[PDB]
Structure formats: structure tokens, C-alpha cells
From a paper:
Replication Protein A (RPA) is an abundant multi-domain heterotrimeric protein complex essential to nearly all DNA processing events inside eukaryotic cells. RPA is thus a critical component for replication, repair, and recombination pathways. The largest subunit, Rfa1, possesses four OB domains: DNA-binding domain-A (DBD-A), B (DBD-B), C (DBD-C), and F (DBD-F), which are connected by flexible linkers. The smallest subunit Rfa3 has a single OB-fold (DBD-E) and forms part of the trimerisation core (Tri-C) consisting of DBD-C of Rfa1, DBD-D of Rfa2, and DBD-E of Rfa3.
We produced recombinant full-length S. cerevisiae RPA heterotrimer complexes of Rfa1, Rfa2, and Rfa3 in bacteria (denoted as ScRPA). Recombinant ScRPA was purified to homogeneity as judged by SDS–PAGE and gel filtration analysis coupled with in-line multi-angle laser light scattering (SEC-MALS), suggesting intact complexes. We used a 100 nt polypyrimidine oligonucleotide to form a RPA-ssDNA complex containing multiple RPA molecules (dT100 and Supplementary Fig. 2a, b). Combining two datasets and several rounds of 2D and 3D classification we isolated a fraction of the particles that enabled a 3D reconstruction corresponding to the ScRPA Tri-C associated with ssDNA to a global resolution of 4.7 Å, a surprisingly high-resolution structure by cryoEM given the small size of the protein–nucleic acid complex (~55 kDa with ssDNA). Although full-length proteins were used to form the ScRPA-ssDNA complexes,, the winged-helix domain, as well as some of the N-terminus of Rfa2 were invisible. The reconstruction measures ~81 Å × ~58 Å × ~36 Å in dimensions and a model of the ScRPA Tri-C (based on homology models) can be fitted into the EM density map. Subsequently, the model was flexibly fitted using molecular dynamics flexible fitting (MDFF)32,33 and further refined using jelly-body refinement routines in Refmac534 within CCPEM35, and real-space refinement procedures in Phenix36. There are a number of yeast-specific insertions compared to the human or fungal structures, the most obvious being for DBD-D and DBD-E. The presence of ssDNA in the reconstruction is further supported by the observation that in the absence of ssDNA, RPA molecules do not assemble into dimers and trimers and the majority of the Tri-C particles were isolated from dimers and trimers. We were able to reconstruct the relatively small Tri-C stably bound to a 20-nt segment of the ssDNA to surprisingly high resolution given its low molecular mass (~55 kDa). Our studies suggest that DBD-A/DBD-B may be more dynamic than previously thought, whereas the trimerization core is more stable on ssDNA.
Residue numbers in the entry:
A (entry chain A): 1 to 122
B (entry chain C): 442 to 619
The structure:
Amino acid sequence: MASETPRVDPTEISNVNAPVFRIIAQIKSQPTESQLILQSPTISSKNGSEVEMITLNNIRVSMNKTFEIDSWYEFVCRNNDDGELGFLILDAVLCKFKENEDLSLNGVVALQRLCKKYPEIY
Amino acid sequence: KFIAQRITIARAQAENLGRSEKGDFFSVKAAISFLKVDNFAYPACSNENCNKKVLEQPDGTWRCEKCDTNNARPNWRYILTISIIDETNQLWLTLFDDQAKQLLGVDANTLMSLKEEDPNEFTKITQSIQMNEYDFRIRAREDTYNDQSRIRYTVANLHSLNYRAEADYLADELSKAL
DNA sequence: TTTTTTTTTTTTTTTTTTTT
């Protein structure tokens, strides 16, 4: 909305308690529609940082927001402060780049890092 | 292995110079601001490598001075330039027949016949093509006509649609900053 | 892995939507 909605890493759930944020990562298909797998690697492989995947529980909320395979989506979500639950799915934006081409997540990760160290600029 | 690092137009005039007399163009990533409505395409004869500008004798058909011929189709060549803006400076770029023909994807004869045409689609193409982002290879030279001399720039090439390489390159530059 | 032959030396882009 009109408030601050920075892009944060899905592993920052411990740092910030129940914010409203957007996530850009890879969407995987679960056996059911009530769960979600977020694949978010970081830069190089053997540099000491590996693929960071976070599993969420979709339940019955946002049925029409189901994500297409291999497609990208901007995740507008709010973290749950109770327990044993991931980020509550609220809104999703259609995200794709071009045809016969792809995008490396590294440029996104360096994004989500900078806005953490520099709150003045988004 | 692609061209990534470059400089700006503000850094083009003086950066730790010189560089006394020597350089050949360089790469620029700059947005397009406005397209001039005057001096678009000058007419000439239809032939390969025409260096002459035809004039009008008291005839009504275009006449070439060096090569005597009757011109059925006054083939137009692009004299049109553009006004561009970059991260710092606002500059002007002169485009040739291939550069201006590649910019809007329309030839010079079809553009001239499009302007004089009854529909208004000429201004629709002019306003639709303007305000975009483009990549050029620009060189600087100083020419003098009579009393007035200044440095002007030209476009030696056009490149666009590159996105992923710039984002990943800047990401690598951010990772190498530590 | 990049080396001129097609002019003249200026150039105006959006000029009207807005409180007491």
C-alpha cells in the first residue's frame, strides 16, 4: 500500500516480526495446493552460500493467486507472529521477463541486501 | 563476453584528460528525449554511394551536378538528428541513413511520404518512437563553417534489448566491492 | 577485436492540470 514494503530475504523471518513485505523467488509445485516451496539460491555455489528454500503453508487463502510453473511472481505477504506457520499469502503480481531468455536471481539477491543496509533508498 | 563498462557524457568532455588528440568514439547507454521535426531527410538521386546533393534547375525535375541523370524517384537520405538525455548530460546525436532508418524502422522515402500524407500517423510514429532508451557508439569532432564552431556527436551503431547482462554485471560489481 | 563519405553548424522537448 502507501507504507514501506521493502524486499526482504525469506530467511529474515527471525529478524523482523510480522511485517508486510514482497518476495521475488522461484515457485515450486507441492503435492497439494495448501503448501508452497520457495527456491531462492544466493550468488555462487561453492563460495559458502547455498540455495535457500523456504516452505510455506497456503491453506485455503488466496485460491485464485496460485502460481504458474516456471513463471515469476511478486509476493505481497505478511508474516504470521503466532507459530508453526509461514508467511500468509495475500497478493501476487505476474512477473516475467522476455521470450527465449531468462534472469539470474543474483541481481535480485544483491538488491534485497542493499535495501537492508540502506533504509533511506528502496 | 560483452561490452559492459563505459563512461557518461559528462565524463566524456573531461575525465582525467588527456587523451590529447587521440580517441575513437566510445559506448554510451542513454535514453532518448525528443525527435526534431525539422531537417529529417534530404533528397538525392537513386544510385549506390551518392555523395552529391541534387538541386532544382528551372525544370521541375531534380538535377545532379556531377552525374547528369534524370531522377524518377528522388531517393531520400536521413539527415535527421535526435535530442537525448543520459544519467548526467543532455546531448544531441546526429544519425545517418542507417542509424535513423534503424531507429524507427522506417526508411527515408516512406517517412517523407508519410509526413506529406493526409493522415496524422506521422506524428503518431514520431511521438511513439520518442522517449525510449538506446545504446550508441558516439564520436566527437570539431568542425567550423564560417564564424561558428563547436563539438558535435554522431551515432556509429545502435544496440538495445540488453537487460540481464547489465543487471548481473552490476550485481557482480556490487559483490566485488567488498 | 573496435578504423567515415549522406548536410551545417542550431537545435526545445509538457507548455496548464492548483488551493485560499
